[PDB]
Design a protein around this ligand. Structure first.
Ligand SMILES: Nc1ncnc2c1ncn2[C@@H]1O[C@H](COP(=O)(O)OP(=O)(O)NP(=O)(O)O)[C@@H](O)[C@H]1O
Ligand SMILES: [Mg+2]
Length: 1151
DNA sequence: TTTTTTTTTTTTTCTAATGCGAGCACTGCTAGCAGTGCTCGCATTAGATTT
């Protein structure tokens, strides 16, 4: 191994950089990145400068991608600034500038990079394969649009039920009897194999042959026991044994059992008494005869169907899932990586690789100590060969804690084997000069602490920037590390979790109270800062642990967050209260479903409130009323407006904040509301939303957005976080209360030392159990390391004489099975006293141990807060006046009051009196009318009608052929009808004189008031005598409309508008009278007058020397259904604006 | 194609380990008996991760 200079590293081929924690591994990535952008290092430099989009960086967490992206952004910026200033105040940039040749061109490339930084390539693996597939699809053999799915547990469970249906339901009674014992149903089976369904499939040690069924195995074991049954039945009834005291004479009664126990094969369980007849058992207390020894053969291998079922099911469920996801064309996290691996694996995949070597002719993988077999197979297959591509693997093998997630150390060690070059970073930059020496001391206690020959520990040296770091608590400095030793002899896990959590809390509030007085300080040299509850972090292994920490820690009135919390809001009680409320406001009529909502802690009502409110009817009616207004807000304005109104009126948003802790509760309420919007839009119903909320109250899921928000950022908080979620992070003061604890793995899963392949032994044979438990322990060490390197100034950690074995007083302390204990005892069992001494041995000036003494004084001393007077400003002017763009439709609107305006007539008369090719029968609505119009839109008037053209319109319309012969006739009647007094046929109109569907915008300047208009209307209009004055609110703005048709005949223009409607009638129900009736009913009066104004202004605009009276021909409403070959008048209607009404009207809209 | 009623509660783990208690065989010490060494069985207690 050689030491590393960032600027000396050749970037060619594969390169491994290894170094301990806090050594700046992440920190160097920046420097190499810059170097790559500029093509620097000379001999060590890459052949050619690279573009930001060609640099691949792959990091472990989505958060890390964000951070590193930012840091690289900043560093590029600063370096550019320096290149323009030619000097800089930072040493690394200074050396870069010494290496750089031309500073100007350098600054140019940098600028360009800085711009490119948006698309800059940084990913995780699961974020990399994702992109890469969707990037090059053919090669990868993917669809182009992949719909992701994040819930793979439901598909998986589905498949497990499918298996357990086809491979279990067929079983006859007797085999089923055996299946039942090992697991009830697939709900449990899934729980057993679940870690093995996900990620790379394991290899199974000594798998059953492929052809063996359940009935086969079962018949086998049937006979295996049967032989012993006959045999024991034959040899029974004789004492040839040498009788011994300790073997108790009543042992012969056991034999009665066995000769009795031999009846049927139906049982899978041999008797406990059989253990007595083992020649290894008895001879310890007389070889007997062979079968006496055969029982030992029978009891040597546990009799089970288990391995076979886990094998068949594990192979099947995996496939089935993959197939169902193929059918939907979906994808998933493990499935992403898997699919890219497979894609490369395939013969075609070699093309694929070639593209990537083009896309990223370098890659820098960070946090590589966590690596998967698949991952390394990929990165190798891509970059292991070919020139001009580099590869940079960055990792500390000491830190790989993720084995549970499928990562494996052994494949890292493999890569470490196949890389010729190693590089090492010497100095820890992260933490105090004390903390370095502490850790070094603790891991130097034994030889080969990490108990992998390939993972040697080395001493590291603090930096010079950190030399002055110190932490002070009540004056004199506190040693960098303090181990809190528990008192007493034997300790169970529970006692330990109570006490140590508690003590941690007591210590934490002391630091705080001394932090508000400014006594305790985090000091770099003379500089300082008090210890806020922010800078403290508490690292725990699991969730239950963390809750155990918080409950005690909030009991002392210190607000605390848990950063790994995946719990979802809907699991809380506030979601439930929200349900009670929404459910009440929905139907306040029901006495019960309302009162329930009133009793909620959210409403904050006493028992006296609800009591009296059950008595006086007036109040109860008032409540019912207010909720009835809430339903209104609910229907009109949506949801969140309602809950807003309720919160204001009830004053709850304030009363919670008054209440202690209620701040959290209020955050939950607001959050839930915010979700009720997101689901509120997509669902149209008011009611289906209450449908929805319940369904989420039942299944909280895991999912991201419904996960709880942090309670408050106002106050600095205790950031209580799991180890794994602390990786790559930094925590100035750090607590490890429960670190002593351990978990002995009963499952047997390990790696072969030779092949380095993940091997599962479905059989419990103790060897493999050992081979695994060694792994569990080494991993626990790596947890300890990572946990200790997190701190900057101070880290405290608990130590206890923990006892796993249930015997009380021995001298057994299992602490040597703890990760930390083994480091204190150098892997030697001791007594609790020996524990205390071994702690005392290493304790000098850094490590300092105090006994763990429970105490309680005061939760904490807030001393409260002072604020001010405060007020909200209030708008004075109206928010805005009326400016609206409307059509005539925005005029009739609706009438609130005695008179309501509708197209239809309310009065109805019943009829008691008692060829389908007719116009009246045509469908109705906006849809049918839009079709009818759209015909005449392209339709040609001079040519007759082509029924084929009809059929292909109706076909497009979706209308059947029930119409085509019915239509093509009618249209001709339309086009052939003469019009007005001129007698014009629609047929006679040349496309030169046609104008189809004119859209116009007509400005209305000063506000247009109804009564100031309808008097002008009624005055000159005979038709406006009918019905009240039109009523529309004051409006100022633009007006829209579509002329159906405009055409000129005899040098004289016309205005044409089609109308259809009329559900009830066919015949003369269209007359001169009834047309004028309906016109007055739907207020087409104002409509045609308005158009005439528009057409008027448009002609006045277009036609040089235009005059209204000379050029204008009147207005024509054509009721399509109204057209009948029998009567020329029916369906057509014509009126002329007075020319005296337009004269004043136009002036009115002008001012 | 017509129409009436009525209100609420229930359950909850399994496996394993020890500690002791009861009963017995032997063996040594002063043929029987007391003790010890022993051994099994019944109840009680404890613990069940990590994106
Ligand atoms: N060369 C350097 N000069 C100055 N400060 C540095 C240098 N290298 C690292 N640091 C600082 O030291 C700390 C640790 O750096 P970091 O890059 O996280 O190391 P690391 O190896 O990635 N730690 P981890 O992710 O836990 O292994 C950071 O707070 C850096 O700012
Ligand atoms: Mg890092």
């Amino acid at each position: 191994a050689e030491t590393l200079d960032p600027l000396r590293l050749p970037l060619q081929g594969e390169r491994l950089i290894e170094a301990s924690a806090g050594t700046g591994k992440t920190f160097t990535i920046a420097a190499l990145y810059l170097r790559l952008l500029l093509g620097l290092g000379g001999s060590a430099a890459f052949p050619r400068p690279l573009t930001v989009e060609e640099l691949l960086v792959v990091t472990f967490t989505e958060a890390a991608t964000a951070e590193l992206r930012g840091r690289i952004r900043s560093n590029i910026h600063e370096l550019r600034i320096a290149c323009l200033r030619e000097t800089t105040d930072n040493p690394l940039y200074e050396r870069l500038l010494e290496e750089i040749d031309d500073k100007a061109q350098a600054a140019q490339w940098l600028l360009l990079a800085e711009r490119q930084m948006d698309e800059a390539a940084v990913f995780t693996i699961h974020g990399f394969c994702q992109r890469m597939l969707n990037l090059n699809a053919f090669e990868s053999g993917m669809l182009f649009e992949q719909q992701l799915i994040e819930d793979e547990s439901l598909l998986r469970y589905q498949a497990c039920a499918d298996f357990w249906r086809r491979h279990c339901y067929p079983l006859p009674r007797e085999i089923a009897q055996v299946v039942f014992e090992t697991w009830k149903g697939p709900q449990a089976l899934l729980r057993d194999i679940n870690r093995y369904l996900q990620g790379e499939a394991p290899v199974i040690k000594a798998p059953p042959p492929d052809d063996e069924t359940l009935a086969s195995r079962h018949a086998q074991i049937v006979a295996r026991i049967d032989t012993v049954k006959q045999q024991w039945r034959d040899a029974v009834g004789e004492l040839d044994a040498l009788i011994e005291s300790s073997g108790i004479d009543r042992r012969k009664f056991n034999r009665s059992n066995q000769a009795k126990w031999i009846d049927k094969i139906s049982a899978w369980a041999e008797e406990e008494t059989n253990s007595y007849q083992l020649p290894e058992s008895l001879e310890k207390f007389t070889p007997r005869h062979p079968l006496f020894e055969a029982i030992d053969q029978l009891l040597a291998e546990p009799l089970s169907i288990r391995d076979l079922v886990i094998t068949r099911a594990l192979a099947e469920i995996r496939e089935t899932v993959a197939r169902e996801k193929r059918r939907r064309g979906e994808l998933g996290f493990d499935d992403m990586l898997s699919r890219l691996d497979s894609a490369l694996r395939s013969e075609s995949g070699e093309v694929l690789a070639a593209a990537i070597r083009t896309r990223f002719p370098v890659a820098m993988i960070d946090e590589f100590q966590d690596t998967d077999p698949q991952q390394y197979r990929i990165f190798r297959r891509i970059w292991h060969h070919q020139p001009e591509t580099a590869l940079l693997l960055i990792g500390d093998p000491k830190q790989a804690i993720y084995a549970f997630r499928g990562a494996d150390i052994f494949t890292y060690m493999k890569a470490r084997s196949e890389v010729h070059a190693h590089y090492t970073l010497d100095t820890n930059w992260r933490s105090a000069p004390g903390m370095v020496n502490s850790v070094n001391k603790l891991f130097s206690q034994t030889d080969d602490a990490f108990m992998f020959r390939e993972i040697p520990f080395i001493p590291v040296k603090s930096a010079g920037k950190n030399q002055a770091l110190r932490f002070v608590f009540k004056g004199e400095t506190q040693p960098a590390m303090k181990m809190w030793l528990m008192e007493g002899e034997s300790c169970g896990v529970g006692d330990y979790q109570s006490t140590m959590a508690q003590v941690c809390a007591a210590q934490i509030r002391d630091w705080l109270q001394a932090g508000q007085r400014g006594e305790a300080l985090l000091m770099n040299g003379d500089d300082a800062r008090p210890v806020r509850a922010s800078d403290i972090s508490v690292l725990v292994r699991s969730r239950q642990e963390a809750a155990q920490v918080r409950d005690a820690l909030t009991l002392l009135e210190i607000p605390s967050v848990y950063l790994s919390n995946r719990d979802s809001v809907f699991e809380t009680l506030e979601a439930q209260e929200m349900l009670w409320l929404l459910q009440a406001v929905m139907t306040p009529e029901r006495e019960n479903t309302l009162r329930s909502a009133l009793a909620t802690s959210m409403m904050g009502l006493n028992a006296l409130d609800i009591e009296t409110l059950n008595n006086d009817e007036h109040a109860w009616d008032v409540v019912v009323e207010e909720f009835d207004g809430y339903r209104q807000i609910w229907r009109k304005r949506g949801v969140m407006p309602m809950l807003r109104a309720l919160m204001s009126a009830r004053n709850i948003a304030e009363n919670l904040l008054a209440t202690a802790g209620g701040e959290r509760r209020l955050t939950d309420i607001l959050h839930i509301s915010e979700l009720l919007q997101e689901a509120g839009t997509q669902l149209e119903s008011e009611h289906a939303l209450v449908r929805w909320l319940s369904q989420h109250i039942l299944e909280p899921d895991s999912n991201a957005s419904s996960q709880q928000m942090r309670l408050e950022s106002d106050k600095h908080l205790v950031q209580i976080v799991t180890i794994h979620k602390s990786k790559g992070l930094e925590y100035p003061l750090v607590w490890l209360p429960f670190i002593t604890n351990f978990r002995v793995q009963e499952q047997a899963f390990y790696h072969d030392r030779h092949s380095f392949e993940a091997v599962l032994d479905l059989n419990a044979a103790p060897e493999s159990v050992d081979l695994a438990e060694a792994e569990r322990l080494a991993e626990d060490l790596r947890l300890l390391y990572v946990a200790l390197t997190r701190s900057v100034w101070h880290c405290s950690l608990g130590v206890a004489p923990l006892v796993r074995r249930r015997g009380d007083k021995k001298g057994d302390t299992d602490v040597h099975q703890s990760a930390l204990g083994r480091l204190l005892q150098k892997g030697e069992p001791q007594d609790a006293a020996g524990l205390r001494t071994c702690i005392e041995a290493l304790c000098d000036d850094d490590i300092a141990w105090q006994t763990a003494q429970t105490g309680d004084n005061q939760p904490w001393q807030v001393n409260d807060v002072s604020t001010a007077e405060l007020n909200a400003k209030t708008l004075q002017r109206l928010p805005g006046d009326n400016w609206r763009v409307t059509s005539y439709s925005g005029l009739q609107q609706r009438x609130x009051x005695x008179x309501x305006x509708x197209x239809x007539x309310x009065x109805x008369x019943x009829x008691x009196x008692x060829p389908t090719l007719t116009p009246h029968q045509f469908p109705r609505g906006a849809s049918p009318g839009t079709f009818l119009h759209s015909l005449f839109e392209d339709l040609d008037f001079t040519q007759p009608v082509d029924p084929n053209w009809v059929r292909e319109k109706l076909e497009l319309g979706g209308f059947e052929s029930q119409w085509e012969p019915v239509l093509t006739e009618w249209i001709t009647a339309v086009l052939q009808a003469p019009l007005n007094e001129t007698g014009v046929s629609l047929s006679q109109l040349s496309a030169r004189n046609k104008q189809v569907e004119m859209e116009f915008y007509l400005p209305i300047s000063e506000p247009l008031i109804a009564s100031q208009l309808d008097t002008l209307i009624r005055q000159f209009d005979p038709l406006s005598a009918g019905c009240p004055p039109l009523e529309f609110m004051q409006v100022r703005g633009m007006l829209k409309g579509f002329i159906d048709l405009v055409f000129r005949h005899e040098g004289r223009y016309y205005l044409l508008a089609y109308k259809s409607n009329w559900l009830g009638e066919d015949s003369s129900a269209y007359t001169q009278q009834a047309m004028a009736a309906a016109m007055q009913a739907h207020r087409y009066d104002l409509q045609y007058q308005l158009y005439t104004l528009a057409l008027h202004r448009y002609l006045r605009h277009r036609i040089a020397d235009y005059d209204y009276e000379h050029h204008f021909g009147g207005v024509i409403y054509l009721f399509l259904r109204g057209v009948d070959k029998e009567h020329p008048q029916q369906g057509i209607y014509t009126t002329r604006p007075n020319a005296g009404l337009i004269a004043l009207m136009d002036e009115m809209f002008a001012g």
